[PDB]
């Protein structure tokens, strides 16, 4: 009933920390995001992940980062984790140069495209907006 | 025999589809701060859905927005867990 965790490493954790954006995107500076990345780095490191932080990535850089990670040998890893910190809209996340679909980032890790993570958890943590609606709350 | 290609993914989003997500300049975002505190305390003893459900509660309860612009004043946030996991996930042993 539990995922097998008896592997040499817990696994790789990629953090993409997008703070500063090209003015053409119209998107502002995401002050507070460094404090998130630092706290995430310690936490995930502490769980046992091999954590690397990439900053202010373009759309092509984010894709290539995830593509490359999906092509590594995870045979001795229990799982994989990726954390995205950026602006976003429904189904999309911002690089510094524009938006890219979240589907395209994660699809690299499908069962058929990353056999060494087959039957292993693939975790995505996403701090980003998903639209413009506000929740007023109640009571 | 076979496994679906979309199986064994989990998406922990900071908010629900269509909605906004909050970030505090001197402190960080609601979701991440909550995620880290629950992971600091319970990362090695709770199952991941237990962890993320508590994160859901923490974001939903502890936080309420405080802005100059009245449009974004006194607002709330609920995160969103999407699970295609096929087993329980503990980060130890």
């Amino acid at each position: 009933y539990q995922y097998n965790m008896n592997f040499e490493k817990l696994g790789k954790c990629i953090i993409i920390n997008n703070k500063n954006f090209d003015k053409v995107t119209g998107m502002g500076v995401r002050n507070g995001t460094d404090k998130d990345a630092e706290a995430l780095f310690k936490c995930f490191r502490s769980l046992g992940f091999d954590v690397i932080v990439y900053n202010d990535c373009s759309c092509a850089k984010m894709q290539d980062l995830l593509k490359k990670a999906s092509e590594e040998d995870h045979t001795n890893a229990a799982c994989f984790a990726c954390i995205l910190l950026s602006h976003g809209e429904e189904n999309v996340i911002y690089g510094k140069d524009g938006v890219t679909p979240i589907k395209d980032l994660t699809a690299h890790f499908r069962g058929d495209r990353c056999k060494t993570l087959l039957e292993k958890p693939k975790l995505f943590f996403i701090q980003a907006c998903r639209g413009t609606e506000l929740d007023d709350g109640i009571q | 025999y076979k496994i679906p290609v979309e199986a064994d993914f989990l998406f922990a989003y900071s908010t629900v589809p269509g909605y906004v997500s909050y970030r505090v300049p001197g402190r960080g975002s609601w979701f991440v701060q909550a995620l880290c505190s629950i992971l600091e305390e319970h990362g090695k003893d709770l199952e991941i859905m237990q962890i993320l459900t508590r994160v859901n509660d923490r974001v939903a309860r502890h936080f309420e927005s405080d802005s100059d612009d009245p449009h974004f004043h006194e607002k709330k946030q609920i995160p969103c867990v999407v699970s295609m996991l096929t087993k329980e996930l503990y980060f130890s042993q």
Binding site: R30, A128 | S21, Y22, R23, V24, D66
Partner: peptide
């Protein structure tokens, strides 16, 4: 508070 700001929004992402």
């Amino acid at each position: 508070d700001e929004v992402x």
